[PDB]
Design a protein around this ligand. Sequence first.
Ligand SMILES: [K+]
Ligand SMILES: [K+]
Ligand SMILES: [K+]
Ligand SMILES: [K+]
Ligand SMILES: [K+]
Ligand SMILES: [K+]
Ligand SMILES: [Mg+2]
Ligand SMILES: [Mg+2]
Ligand SMILES: [Mg+2]
Ligand SMILES: [Mg+2]
Ligand SMILES: [Mg+2]
Length: 1277
Amino acid sequence: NASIYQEFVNKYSLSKTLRFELIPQGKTLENIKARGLILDDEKRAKDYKKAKQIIDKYHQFFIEEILSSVCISEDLLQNYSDVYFKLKKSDDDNLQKDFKSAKDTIKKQISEYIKDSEKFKNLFNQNLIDAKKGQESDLILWLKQSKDNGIELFKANSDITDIDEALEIIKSFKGWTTYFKGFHENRKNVYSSNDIPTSIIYRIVDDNLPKFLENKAKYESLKDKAPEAINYEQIKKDLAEELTFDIDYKTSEVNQRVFSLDEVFEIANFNNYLNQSGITKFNTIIGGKFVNGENTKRKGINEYINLYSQQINDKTLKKYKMSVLFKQILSDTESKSFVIDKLEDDSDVVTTMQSFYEQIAAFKTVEEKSIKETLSLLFDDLKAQKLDLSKIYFKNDKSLTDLSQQVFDDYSVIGTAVLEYITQQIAPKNLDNPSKKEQELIAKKTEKAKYLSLETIKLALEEFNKHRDIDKQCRFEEILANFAAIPMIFDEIAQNKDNLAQISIKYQNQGKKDLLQASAEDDVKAIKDLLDQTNNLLHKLKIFHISQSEILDKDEHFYLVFEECYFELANIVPLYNKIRNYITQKPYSDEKFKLNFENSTLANGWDKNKEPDNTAILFIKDDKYYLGVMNKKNNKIFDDKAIKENKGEGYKKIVYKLLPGANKMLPKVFFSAKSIKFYNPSEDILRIRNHSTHTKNGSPQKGYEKFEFNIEDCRKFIDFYKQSISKHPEWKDFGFRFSDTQRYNSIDEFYREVENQGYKLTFENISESYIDSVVNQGKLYLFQIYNKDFSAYSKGRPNLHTLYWKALFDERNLQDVVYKLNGEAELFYRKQSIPKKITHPAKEAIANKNKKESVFEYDLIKDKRFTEDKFFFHCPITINFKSSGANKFNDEINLLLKEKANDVHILSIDRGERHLAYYTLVDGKGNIIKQDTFNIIGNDRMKTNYHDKLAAIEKDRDSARKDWKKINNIKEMKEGYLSQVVHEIAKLVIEYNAIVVFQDLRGRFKVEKQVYQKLEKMLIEKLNYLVFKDNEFDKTGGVLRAYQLTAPFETFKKMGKQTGIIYYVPAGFTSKICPVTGFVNQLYPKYESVSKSQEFFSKFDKICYNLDKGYFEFSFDYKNFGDKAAKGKWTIASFGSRLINFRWDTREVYPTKELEKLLKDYSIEYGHGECIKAAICGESDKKFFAKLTSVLNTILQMRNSKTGTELDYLISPVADVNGNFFDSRQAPKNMPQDADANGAYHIGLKGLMLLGRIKNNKKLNLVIKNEEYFEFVQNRN
RNA sequence: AAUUUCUACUGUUGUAGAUAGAUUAAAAGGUAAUUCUAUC
DNA sequence: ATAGAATTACCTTTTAATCT
Ligand SMILES: [K+]
Ligand SMILES: [K+]
Ligand SMILES: [K+]
Ligand SMILES: [K+]
Ligand SMILES: [K+]
Ligand SMILES: [K+]
Ligand SMILES: [Mg+2]
Ligand SMILES: [Mg+2]
Ligand SMILES: [Mg+2]
Ligand SMILES: [Mg+2]
Ligand SMILES: [Mg+2]
């Protein structure tokens, strides 16, 4: 049976690259190493990285210079801001155009500034690095000027020593300017006025300007609604350095001073936040900073906002949180906050540890006692009540809470005890309501008090126990006992030290960095442990430490001795951070590097004419393919003379002919002064060329006036191009077969025909003896292009990439090209990265995961490919070369779907916590044909659960981050797993004439297990060019005629809700809805007030108990509530039990019995079937409405699941026509067996609505509003 | 337990399926340490 | 014991440009 997508073949051209191994042939590798080419290119990669760093320093200076010259007027900024805020409340077209114009005028200002500078003329051309003898290069001039001045550009750079080495490096790349072409293209994107995020124009205007305006709005709104939020005096003291600016752009005053927050948020002063320095200032104003030697961190705006929010208990203030500005496009980032030193190697770590612990061991206080003995005696005297508890204090911070949790198993015991004691002491009368002065005194004595005396704690606890029960009361002796056990910790530490003794010697060598290796895990596990132990001790002592308040009267001997000890111990904080920062690094791994073979243009073009200049040639021998690179000194090996002289049977050399960019190439050859006389152009053809009458918008020659386009002129010009092509020496051999000139309506059509037909591969036979000679002498370097399919023992279906490569040269492809070979291929070298461990030696039994054992005559080495040095070949090709990219691809897909809508199915896919992905196949009527999870994707005998695999990897990564172990990759597992899912989905799409449907949510999931967006992206990519290896070479679905069922997808930003056959529906109410009735919970019952909740409950029609069915019925009409988006009359029932997730753990809740208990407690009679709605609305108790609303929510919770188990079911609170309530546990085959299945099925129903809109359609919209969705789903059936 | 490379394999010097590279920039998130605070 | 707002350090993944 034929597929409906048979027509969608060869629809648009796309680009791919294939990857192969290069296997050196004969003496090739010997000659390579003899000349040391691999060494040369290894050094050149390092030099190239350095050169790019140097160019980047020049670019950073240029950017700072431009942004220092730039000034954006306050009027432009205010106009932008006004239109920008007006855009928020309306989508009108005039506002869109006005915003576009303001954005573009600001961009134009900055773009003029960048064009004006002199350096910009030579910023991306050859003149940067290499110039002639007359003038030196701009980069070299800037380096020499910087050296002449007192500035050392490469102090921060570790790879470059000084500017003299920088000069060496730039001078070494003379004659290699083309090597930087691409890089310079990258750099052009930094200054482009187009809407590309790589530009500083973009970063200022598209990114940072809206953030600053939003922050200014938030600042003024906060000033109105929370004036007491930010402490302006303190923030001006703390952040003076970042509030200092030279120029107030509102008043134009060139005065350097500390700005007010009012000034920093004046719109014009946005001019101060364009460069990286001002960006860091502004972001520091938002974020505060740590200052070396100050124990308290200085606060920014957001911290004052959050503290005030916590103070007055208003979470609405979270709305006014400031947004950090994004960095400037090439800037090195400077931190205003403190930055810790760095340990260099293993020896640093071990020596610093040993110094710390020897210091802690040998230390003695003024009372000549060790830390251990001293703390022991101190806490023993404390235990024995020998000290004045009114002169010893606990910090009233998290340390006291931690103590309460550790000793009384409740963090709030000590705090509430002290609050009750101070409340009872300051005001015995009016305990519930303190006075206006007593409230401030209370809070100042407890909440505001930095420290609390042990006296206060003890008396508070003793008064607290009176009103506490006997089984659970908290005694001060328990706190004293906790402190008396602390010295023992020291002894425990001792043990580890001796063990670590040995460990120290292991890593006492310097420069080794062996602690970053995985083999050191065990030893690291010890180190961390010791550190962790010490750290914990520190915190247990931290509660006594007094911060930088240098006031309360204290036992001065106690505190002298304690602070001596604590100061010595507290060096563990820096040591801990240093060691963590070192060990967590991932160890250095070699990367592959580019091979050039002494050629800056090694594979930039395969054309025969370019062979001596690019030196890359392709050969075919039997069924094998070969890449050959000519020695730079011997690049005439395959000139025409040698080919004629050495015609032989051995190798088939590819001869490559390409006529690219016809619109520039043809007139370059025909009107060039060298040959313009040859292709004799008439005066009329020259008149067509001079005034561009053959084009609508082309440029005229020699400054003539452009004449209106004339199709007759265009066709005569096309005919001159044809005549000239036939006169041309090399192009005549393309065998062009143009359509009739009268068929053309545009010059571009003819150009496209030229470019389509202007690619031809042919072959020349060459003596094997000649290839062997030239590869032996070292004049040719020869490699076989290889993957596992070219093995003599392959004997199976090949890789898709193998098929594409072979099709490049297939007779059937060459007669009408779909696979075209492109230029700018690349060669790489990859050094061996793991030791060759022979994992399964020959003639030994090996265990099978599914025969129970296997044996082989040969060895089997794990990761053999990484146990030796290898060459690689990245080769770019174009597929569907003669067709062009179709803008109207979605429209054609929709036309096809409208014609054959009866054959169409809906493959809808949802995600879940329990299911990585879950699919639902729906027929045109809305019935479910298929449904299964994608967690298990092992077909046939072997089944693999990639959900468990991915969840295990996630747990492993969490464990690793915590334990300083190497974080293993989860990305490769997700890609290998999704390949199978994509395969299955393609198969389904074609077997069932399906369209795929997903839900709208971007890129911020933070559940490492989740795979939804990656699956979308991989599926789009696959459906761009769908080949089935089992199809026929020239039939639909084969190599020449692949399915194209999706649009190209350049970005997600561009992509709407349809790419080809993949549609997106809103995720709203896809899984929290009934599959039978369509009921959805748009009553949102929350408890606010008694008046509000009785107002709510009076909107129902009736509320009663049903005896004949034994459950409560709430009947209502959705029209009586806020919005008519959901409409209709519904009766909901307390039928069935529910599962509640709390802290996770789960709980069985029976709502009918809870409703019974609540009605008995308030003595409302329901037992005879009476309607109790009036009695509900008349109740006055807060608790009644709170519990009623809670039970009503529980009734509406259709998704019920126990976390940590399989069950995730869905029960409806609405009964069907037969009186049954849907439950996924006992649901028919055509019904969703699962909550996630329900989500998939309703995503599919939204897709079915879309199919309907396609079938019945000009101006087709795939926007699905909730109203139409509800009407569709719950209307019938 | 072999790979252009990934995943699952042993399917026997390999078997399925997938596989757009190079370069450049930026963002997002995770974990720890530290600061100030809020919680029935 | 949860958690919020910051800073620093280490890490992985994702997205969007240029060319092919
Ligand atoms: K400026
Ligand atoms: K102010
Ligand atoms: K590590
Ligand atoms: K490779
Ligand atoms: K497939
Ligand atoms: K893959
Ligand atoms: Mg001005
Ligand atoms: Mg060259
Ligand atoms: Mg194969
Ligand atoms: Mg290149
Ligand atoms: Mg493997």
